[PDB]
Write a protein that binds this ligand. Structure first.
Ligand SMILES: [Zn+2]
Lengths: 108, 108
């Protein structure tokens, strides 16, 4: 379907945009925001510990996108087994999840 | 270092932007470009099979970024164990790698 394709593109684009903002937060802070801090950490410095350092004016993203069905995206952090995920719940409660965003390596 | 911090932010930002473009390519084609097709497949329809379907005007990214030290970013796809990575070689040949970008799930 056409609407379905467009919705899928929005979900994937938003989740990767959130991923990038979360990675910029982590470069400044050495860790991602926790689920307790939430994606809100990307727009205002978190009140819950661990506190952010050198928080940039305006935060890390211009706005927090919502999914095509009007649900906020959700953050699992630090997550089970230290795997950080960002997901949409979908229209039907079958989550579309961008998994283990922290899987980066230095060296081969 | 100040330059070093800037370079690191650029590498992470670029690699995530490339990740997003690759994911959009995959939504249209059901698979990522292969290493043989390369990141070039994000800017112009790939000459090598498997050919892209209905390739969009302007491709998937305005232009390919280069890393802070003048090297192209590199794509491993489909990769060892089907794990797709995008990386910078670094100034010193110690790669900074955004790993297993295809790790997404449907359902919990
Ligand atoms: Zn990712």
């Amino acid at each position: 379907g056409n609407k379905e394709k467009a919705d899928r593109q929005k979900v994937v684009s938003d989740l990767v945009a959130l991923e990038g903002a979360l990675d910029m937060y982590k470069l400044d802070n050495s860790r991602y925001p926790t689920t307790e801090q939430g994606l809100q950490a990307l727009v205002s410095a978190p009140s819950a510990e661990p506190h952010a350092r050198n928080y940039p004016e305006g935060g890390y993203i211009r706005r927090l996108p919502q999914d095509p069905w009007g649900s906020d995206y959700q953050l699992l952090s630090p997550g089970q087994h230290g795997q950080v995920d960002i997901f949409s719940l979908g229209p039907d409660g079958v989550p579309e999840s961008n998994d283990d965003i922290g899987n980066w390596t230095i060296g081969f």
